[PDB]
Design a binder for this molecule. Structure first.
Ligand SMILES: Nc1ncnc2c1ncn2[C@@H]1O[C@H](COP(=O)(O)OP(=O)(O)OP(=O)(O)O)[C@@H](O)[C@H]1O
Ligand SMILES: [Mg+2]
Lengths: 308, 340
């Protein structure tokens, strides 16, 4: 008559939520918060379950220019030092240009954004350019910004921080606050925030990705937003994440030891592993399969916001 | 503001601020009745002298002089303020987009024949812009202007990188643009898609082709290829939006096979209104097929606007586009364009 009792080796919040979730023997039917979900094979239920879990446990439930200005104006820095091999120089009387292979694409950058060396070097020679930190279109639905400081060489592990936000107004202030805090602590981060007003509210209305050492930045963002939790944020957070305040949660990007079955978003990754283990039980107890599934995805079943 | 200015100087009154809806597209448009109870469509292309407005007028000058026996129609230009970039047209009543028709199953073989006749007629010359059209943008295959990267999603940037790093594709596109200097050119839309067509009377009336901002003297293979490629794109993506890559290709291949009659229909409508298109242009089917291949990259990159990641249906579609662009002769035969 106790959730931890019937579901051991599992974070409590999780073991609790597995009480609202049933998968029938055969793996063609399942219940998730008293919403039923139906499929014609196991394999097809794997997908529909993942989506139902993702919606109830992780999430719940235009690009207005005014907001974007409000959101854009809330940024400390204006530029980020970006490396890449030079290809070619283009002499123009209009203004010279560097053809640079960035890591995501080959681009044509005004040569006045060079920073190192300050004299355009030979082709192939690494160069460091100064590019805008605000990228409003890069993440559909989201205004997006990169830290003023270059992220680590391999990027490595990444700490996500989710900030619920009731509305645009909420978000603006949480945005300004969080970025203000993050530059002061000199965090190696990226970040983004919903730029569509009629899409709030959302648990991940603001996301912050933090590299190398997250403590300074985390500690810093925590304190800057304490004041607002509950009212400007919303109470509730993903069951996969570690809460730090009302509307403020966090977790690590997914590390996964299995090939092919890897490289998802944090929510979908967990929900996938969770749905997998539930599904694997129904093809005959239950929490032992769930727990095994999580560990094959490199998720700590006691601390699902963390990895092995 | 200049819309009512112009609408008044034209005998049309002003537009009811309500009942005046707005269709999609980058440019601002207003549709609905005016105070004199006449139905208008108003488009605005803001200037700095816009080449797009001039090209749109170069067409409405030709279309005004067309007999009713013509398979090619334009709704009708009521007037225009070149200075401020405003254009007024007769609104087509209860107009459904060819893109809605496609998804609803109603862009059938008969309507594809209509479209071909219309496009065949268009292609059968002073007043016209003769500049090369920037599609595909060749310098972007070398490098994207940094300004443009800041208006693209992560998925668009990743698609462009795939293209940029594919030497065979880039080179095929160069050869295709060079042929345009050495072939019989013809009046051409240069931006053809299902959503550049409208059918009147909720999809029961006449077929209109619109948006003539790219109207030029160009390779007619652009228009044939664009329409074939609309079906290739539809068949291998729009209809399919954790399967295996081999399962996604097989599903897409079958979908394509079943949508081929649509392209053969268009080509027969085209040859009905332009039977001697191959007289001095034997490469037209091959070139059309290459443009259809590129058209798939074009639509993929456009639909990826609203994505952070390039999903595996997108990638499989892109793979078919590369088969068509790098193998245009075989694709012409399979798409039904080699027909005589
Ligand atoms: N006369 C008309 N009557 C009814 N509908 C029309 C008329 N003219 C255009 N439309 C519809 O409105 C849409 C918008 O017009 P148009 O395509 O010219 O816009 P645009 O801003 O040039 O778009 P884009 O460049 O993005 O294609 C058309 O695609 C068509 O569906
Ligand atoms: Mg249009």
């Amino acid at each position: 008559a106790s959730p931890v009792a019937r579901h051991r080796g599992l974070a409590p919040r999780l073991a609790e939520a597995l009480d609202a979730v049933s998968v029938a023997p055969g793996a063609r039917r399942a219940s998730v918060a008293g919403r039923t979900v139906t499929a014609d094979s196991p394999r097809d239920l794997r997908g529909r379950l993942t989506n139902a879990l993702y919606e109830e446990l992780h999430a719940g439930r235009l690009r207005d220019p005014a907001l974007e200005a409000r959101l854009a104006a809330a940024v400390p820095h204006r530029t980020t030092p970006t490396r890449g091999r030079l290809v070619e120089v283009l002499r123009r009387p209009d203004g010279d240009q560097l053809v640079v292979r960035l890591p995501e694409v080959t681009a044509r950058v005004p040569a006045d954004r060079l920073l190192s060396p300050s004299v355009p070097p030979a082709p192939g020679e690494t160069v460091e350019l100064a590019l805008e930190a605000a990228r409003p279109a890069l993440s559909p639905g989201f205004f997006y910004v990169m830290g003023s400081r270059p992220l680590p060489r391999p990027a490595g592990a990444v700490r996500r921080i989710f900030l619920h936000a009731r509305d645009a107004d909420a978000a603006v202030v949480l945005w300004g606050a969080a970025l203000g805090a993050l530059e002061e602590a000199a965090a190696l981060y990226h970040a983004k925030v919903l730029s569509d007003p009629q899409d709030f509210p959302r648990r991940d209305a603001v996301v912050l990705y933090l590299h190398g050492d997250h403590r300074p930045g985390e500690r810093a963002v925590t304190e800057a937003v304490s004041r607002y939790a509950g009212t400007l944020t919303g109470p509730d957070t993903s069951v996969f994440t570690e809460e730090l305040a009302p509307g403020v949660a966090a977790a690590w990007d997914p590390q996964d030891p299995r090939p092919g079955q890897s490289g998802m978003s944090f929510g979908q990754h967990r929900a996938f592993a969770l749905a997998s283990g539930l599904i694997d039980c129904a093809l005959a107890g239950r929490a032992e399969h769930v727990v095994r599934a999580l560990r094959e995805a490199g998720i700590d079943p006691l601390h699902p916001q963390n990895n092995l | 503001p200049a819309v009512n200015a112009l609408l008044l100087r034209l005998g049309l009154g002003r537009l009811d601020a309500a009942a005046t809806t707005a269709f999609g597209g980058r440019n601002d448009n207003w549709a609905g009745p005016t105070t004199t109870g006449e139905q208008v469509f108003v488009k605005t292309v803001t200037p700095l002298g816009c080449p797009e407005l001039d090209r749109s007028l170069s067409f409405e000058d030709l279309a005004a002089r067309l007999t009713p026996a013509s398979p090619l129609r334009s709704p009708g230009l009521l007037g225009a303020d070149p200075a401020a970039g405003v254009m007024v047209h007769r609104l087509v009543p209860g107009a459904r987009s060819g893109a809605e028709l496609a998804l609803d199953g109603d862009f059938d073989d008969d309507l594809c024949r209509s479209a071909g006749r219309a496009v065949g007629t268009l292609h059968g010359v002073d007043g016209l812009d003769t500049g090369e059209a920037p599609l595909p943008p060749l310098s972007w295959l070398k490098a994207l202007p940094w300004s443009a990267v800041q208006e693209r999603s992560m998925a668009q940037i990743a698609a462009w990188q795939l293209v940029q790093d594919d030497t065979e594709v880039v080179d095929a596109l160069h050869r295709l643009r060079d042929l345009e200097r050495t072939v019989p050119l013809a009046p051409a839309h240069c931006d053809l898609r299902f959503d550049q067509f409208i059918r009147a009377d909720e999809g029961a009336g006449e077929l209109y082709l619109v948006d003539w901002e790219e109207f030029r003297l160009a390779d007619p293979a652009r228009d044939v290829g664009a329409f074939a490629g609309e079906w290739l794109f539809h068949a291998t993506y729009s209809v399919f939006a954790g399967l295996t890559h081999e399962e996604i290709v097989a599903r897409g291949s079958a979908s394509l096979r079943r949508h081929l009659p649509r392209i053969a229909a268009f080509w027969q409508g085209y040859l009905e209104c332009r039977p001697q298109a191959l007289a001095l242009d034997a490469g037209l089917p091959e070139r059309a097929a290459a443009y259809a291949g590129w058209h798939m990259y074009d639509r993929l990159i456009a639909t990826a606007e609203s994505h952070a990641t390039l999903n595996p249906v997108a990638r499989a579609a892109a793979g078919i586009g590369r088969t068509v662009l790098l193998g245009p002769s075989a694709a012409a035969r399979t798409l039904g364009l080699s027909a005589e």
